[PDB]
Amino acid sequence: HDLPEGFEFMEHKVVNKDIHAPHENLETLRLTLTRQDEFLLREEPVKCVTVTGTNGEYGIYPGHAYKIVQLNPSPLTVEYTDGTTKKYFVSGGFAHINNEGSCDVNTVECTLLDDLDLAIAEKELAAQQAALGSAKDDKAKSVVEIRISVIEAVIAALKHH
Amino acid sequence: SNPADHFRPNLKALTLYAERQHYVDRWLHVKERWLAPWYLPWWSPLFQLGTWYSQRSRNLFLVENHLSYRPYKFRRNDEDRNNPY
Amino acid sequence: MFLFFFCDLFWLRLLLCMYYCVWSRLCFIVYFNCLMLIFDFLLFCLFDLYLFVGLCLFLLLWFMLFNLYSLILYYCITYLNLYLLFCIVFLLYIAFLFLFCFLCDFFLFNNLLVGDSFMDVFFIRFLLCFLECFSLLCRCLSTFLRLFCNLLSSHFLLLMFFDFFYFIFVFFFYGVFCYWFILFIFVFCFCLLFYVFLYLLDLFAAILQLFIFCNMILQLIMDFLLFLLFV
Amino acid sequence: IALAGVGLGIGTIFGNLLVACARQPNLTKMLFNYAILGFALTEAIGLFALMLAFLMLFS
Amino acid sequence: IALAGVGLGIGTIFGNLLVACARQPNLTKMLFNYAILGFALTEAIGLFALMLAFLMLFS
Amino acid sequence: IALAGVGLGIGTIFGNLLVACARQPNLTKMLFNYAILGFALTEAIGLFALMLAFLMLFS
Amino acid sequence: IALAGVGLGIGTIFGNLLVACARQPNLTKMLFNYAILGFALTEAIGLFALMLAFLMLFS
Amino acid sequence: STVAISVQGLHYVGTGLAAIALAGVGLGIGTIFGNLLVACARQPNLTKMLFNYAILGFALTEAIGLFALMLAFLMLFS
Amino acid sequence: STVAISVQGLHYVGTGLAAIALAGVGLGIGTIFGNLLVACARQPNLTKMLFNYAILGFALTEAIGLFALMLAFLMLFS
Amino acid sequence: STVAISVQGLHYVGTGLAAIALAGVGLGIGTIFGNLLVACARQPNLTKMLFNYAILGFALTEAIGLFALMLAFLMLFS
Amino acid sequence: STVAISVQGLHYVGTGLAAIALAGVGLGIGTIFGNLLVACARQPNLTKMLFNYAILGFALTEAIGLFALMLAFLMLFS
Amino acid sequence: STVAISVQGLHYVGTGLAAIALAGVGLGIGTIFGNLLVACARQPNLTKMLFNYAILGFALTEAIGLFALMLAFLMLFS
Numbered sequence A: 001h002d003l004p005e006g007f008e009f010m011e012h013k014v015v016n017k018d019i020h021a022p023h024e025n026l027e028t029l030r031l032t033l034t035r036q037d038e039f040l041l042r043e044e045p046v047k048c049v050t051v052t053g054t055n056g057e058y059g060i061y062p063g064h065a066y067k068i069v070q071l072n073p074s075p076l077t078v079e080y081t082d083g084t085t086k087k088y089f090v091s092g093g094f095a096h097i098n099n100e101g102s103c104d105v106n107t108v109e110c111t112l113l114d115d116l117d118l119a120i121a122e123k124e125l126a127a128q129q130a131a132l133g134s135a136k137d138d139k140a141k142s143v144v145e146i147r148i149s150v151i152e153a154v155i156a157a158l159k160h161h
Numbered sequence B: 001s002n003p004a005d006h007f008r009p010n011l012k013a014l015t016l017y018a019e020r021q022h023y024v025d026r027w028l029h030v031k032e033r034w035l036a037p038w039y040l041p042w043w044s045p046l047f048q049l050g051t052w053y054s055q056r057s058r059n060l061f062l063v064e065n066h067l068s069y070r071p072y073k074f075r076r077n078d079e080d081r082n083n084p085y
Numbered sequence C: 001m002f003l004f005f006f007c008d009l010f011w012l013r014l015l016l017c018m019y020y021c022v023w024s025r026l027c028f029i030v031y032f033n034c035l036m037l038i039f040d041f042l043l044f045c046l047f048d049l050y051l052f053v054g055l056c057l058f059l060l061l062w063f064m065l066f067n068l069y070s071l072i073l074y075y076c077i078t079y080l081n082l083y084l085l086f087c088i089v090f091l092l093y094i095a096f097l098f099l100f101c102f103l104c105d106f107f108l109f110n111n112l113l114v115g116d117s118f119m120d121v122f123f124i125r126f127l128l129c130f131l132e133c134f135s136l137l138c139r140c141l142s143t144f145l146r147l148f149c150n151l152l153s154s155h156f157l158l159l160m161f162f163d164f165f166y167f168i169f170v171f172f173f174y175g176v177f178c179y180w181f182i183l184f185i186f187v188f189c190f191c192l193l194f195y196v197f198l199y200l201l202d203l204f205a206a207i208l209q210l211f212i213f214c215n216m217i218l219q220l221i222m223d224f225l226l227f228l229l230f231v
Numbered sequence D, E, F, G: 001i002a003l004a005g006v007g008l009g010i011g012t013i014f015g016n017l018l019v020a021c022a023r024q025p026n027l028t029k030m031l032f033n034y035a036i037l038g039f040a041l042t043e044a045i046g047l048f049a050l051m052l053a054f055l056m057l058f059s
Numbered sequence H, I, J, K, L: 001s002t003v004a005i006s007v008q009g010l011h012y013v014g015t016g017l018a019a020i021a022l023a024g025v026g027l028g029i030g031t032i033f034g035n036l037l038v039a040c041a042r043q044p045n046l047t048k049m050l051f052n053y054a055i056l057g058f059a060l061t062e063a064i065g066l067f068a069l070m071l072a073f074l075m076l077f078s
């Protein structure tokens, strides 16, 4: 009595390029932006994608080397070959960049920057800062500071444009 | 110079001098005295140990034919590089 | 020429006799690695790998009685000569090397020929073997040279700094009563700090150099040890 | 001796170029242009050093 | 010889420029200006050494 | 020759600046100010060496 | 002595080449060609130094 | 024979050498500020403490530079 | 013939050379601080243990610079 | 004609040259501690172990500087 | 005319120049231990194996300094 | 006038300068092993192959050191 593995029912596998192979000139990056097991974009050909990992900002274009990036609460930009920019905001996750020309950005939450409100974000920062003052212990203060970092990133993200 | 002079032994008591010839001769006399008795045959390992290596070294010294000059081991002055004598 | 002299350990010998007429435990050792050569259990060696313990302990004791106490002013390092240290290291190193060679196991030297069969034997591997055979003797020479030079340099520096401190303290202390007393006080504080720092540095360096001196010999021994596995 | 710095600096530029090109091959053209620019500047310093050499060797 | 530490410094700037460009290439137009600024300062230092190389060479 | 290090030191600052800017473009102004600060400090040493050179030149 | 800054620069280029080929193992050809270009330019600098060395040697 | 010579242009040569040490100081400054920028980008929240530590590093490095510079000036005027 | 010569001003030359030994010392100190900033930026909670080690490294590096400086001043007064 | 000359002051020059060896040693020591800080921020649990290895490296590197310093004293005192 | 001159203090200069080679050896050793400290924090389980290789480099790096040190003696004592 | 001079003590300077070439060899060896330690931690499963390549690099650098020593010994004697 052998049971199927849950990945057998998934028909869109990841294609890796053999290292001993000729190079190709690619003008499109196939992006897959995902939230909570839901794709907001699927194998979408884009011109470039900008992502904020722990070390700093990465601008991924077609042909980028194989790399895994641990995202931080921050904006994410997608620029199409047409010349159109779409801006999301992520709270965390990972970004897998493949040398074959694909980028699978899996986020816990990915919301268009339009949806976010600066007035709500601003007043939340004031409340959390007050909460940090009343934070009982070290652990509580650390959690509150996590919220402030995201809020300030959101506030700064919207003030940018 | 003065700091270098601080690295010398501080408890020197006595110095004695002796010529190589004199004490070598005395050692040879002692060795002959102890190896002379009949109850030590010449073919014994002890006698050969005593004599053979010394004989070999002395023979090697005698056979030596060097084109260069070796200054006397026990000169009065051996610090002058330009005066081997 | 026969010179009769004495070492500078007579008082220390007296103290050893006084304080070690009765047994005492030893738990702190400068070079502990001579006792624990094997770290993975079930590994054992048919060679007398623990023969170096006694010599190691005695050498540590001797060199510590000399070097550590040399920080005291006017204390003499009676053995501080280049060729004497060469003789000591020659004794130890060559004795262990001849112990390995008298075993008459030529395969023990197979590792001298560095590299694999892929590398050219004559132009690469043979040259590497030559360099390694040379490097053994170079390791011996480096051990003795390092031991000599560390002490020599440390004590030269200490003597020079002490002379400078004596000079300024004696011939410029009157500045305390003068209007430039602040400069003298600053200089004196700096001299005290340098004095303390030098003493700490020398204390640490002596022990560390003894550790390295024993570790070179132990590395020589370990380079030719082969461990069997229990079954 | 000034050429030692110039030669090393030129090699440094190309060393980064390979890392940059491998990271993002799509920009090789733009990076190559900038790398040449850097070489055109470092070599210019070398001209002064050579000029001094030729202005003292032939003097 | 001072030029060796100048020309090499220039190469270092460009070498980091390539990596900076190859990290986020949309800021190239901004980084390039800063890269020129650095070249404008290190080159200025080279002039001082060049000045002495000329004053002593004609005096 | 003292300028060799000073010129090189400037290149290091203007080399890392690009990497810092590319990583965090939002802080270009603060990083740029610190880069200028470092350049001024290095230039101070450059003038010290330059002062000695001129004094020994016209003396 | 100028050759010291040449050989080192050449080693820097190839050292980065290996890393670049490791990071992006399919782009070996372009990296190899660019590395050869950097070597040629750096070697040209060394040849200039050799030119001066032989000119003075036979003068 | 005993000959004593006094060359009056060798107090310049020693001065120039003492100035060379400044390069090791000036380059050291750039390294501290070369890595300060990276640290600020990595952790912008510590833009202040890092800056203070960098100032401490620059001052200490400059202290070496001035110790050398003292020898440079002493031999220039003596 | 035996000729003995005593050149006075050479001590200036030797002193300047020892001053160059402070180039690496100044550079070495700057390197330590530059690395310190990165370590603090990548591990901000250890702002004191790293600082202590940086001071320890500076002290040892300063010691080397002081050994050379002793010769620099000693020859200048010889 | 055969002329033998003995310049006394040269010993200063050789002494200063040996001091230059400390530039590498001083720089080398700073390199070790720089890595130590950048390593303790990557794995602080081993800080004590790393500190031990750092000190061992410092002595080995320092030992070389003493070799050069010995030659300086030999020529400076001869 | 044929003139032969023997300058009797030049061996000091050669000895100091050979001593300068020790700067590279010291720097290389510091680089080795700097890489060791930053490598152990990455793979601590293999700390011991790395240490053995680090010593090997020191054994193969300190030896070169001996040659330069050897030449110093061959010229200092001759 | 035509004057020919033969200085007997200039070979010491040449020997010392050649010995300085070892500073690069020593530093190159340190770099080789420094990367070796880093590589082994990264991919410990290839320790032997990396060790073999490191030995090859050390040999080539040592060969250059031998050439420098050959020139040093030749000038020292000849």
Ligand SMILES: CCCCCCCCCCCCCCCCCC(=O)OC[C@H](COP(=O)([O-])OCC(O)COP(=O)([O-])OC[C@@H](COC(=O)CCCCCCCCCCCCCCCCC)OC(=O)CCCCCCCCCCCCCCCCC)OC(=O)CCCCCCCCCCCCCCCCC
Binding pocket: C002, C003, C004, C005, C006, C007
């Ligand atoms: C011509 C002038 C005279 C000199 C002639 C010399 C002839 C030379 C011939 C040619 C030799 C060529 C080669 C020479 C190489 C030398 C190399 C060298 O020096 O290396 C340094 C090296 C230094 O070693 P170290 O690390 O200092 O340690 C050695 C020490 O001995 C300490 O080591 P240790 O403590 O580990 O040793 C063990 C120690 C363990 O500890 C002890 O036992 C404690 C005591 C230590 C004594 C030894 C230290 C001596 C200290 C200095 C002198 C003390 C005061 C002497 C006062 C003299 C006043 C004039 O025990 C002993 O020493 C055993 C002896 C104890 C004797 C006790 C006697 C009690 C008598 C009581 C009588 C009571 C009578 C009552 C009557 C009542 C009536 C009513 O020397 C040696 O290793 C030994 C070299 C000896 C070579 C052989 C020489 C030949 C023998 C000569 C004997 C002469 C006797 C006649 C003299 C008469 C007075 C003038």
Ligand SMILES: CCCCCCCCCCCCCCCCCC(=O)OC[C@H](COP(=O)([O-])OCC[N+](C)(C)C)OC(=O)CCCCCCCCCCCCCCCCC
Binding pocket: C015, C016, C019, C068, C069, C071, C072, C073, C162, C166, C199, C203
């Ligand atoms: C394990 C680590 C051990 C650390 C030990 C730390 C000891 C700390 C000592 C503090 C200062 C002590 C001052 C003592 C003063 C004595 C009188 C005097 O004038 O001294 C001047 C002397 C020299 O001072 P000076 O240089 O100012 O002398 C000036 C004199 N003129 C002007 C004539 C030149 O003091 C010293 O030398 C003190 C140095 C001590 C360094 C530490 C030595 C440790 C090793 C020996 C340990 C021995 C233990 C034995 C136990 C039994 C073993 C079986």
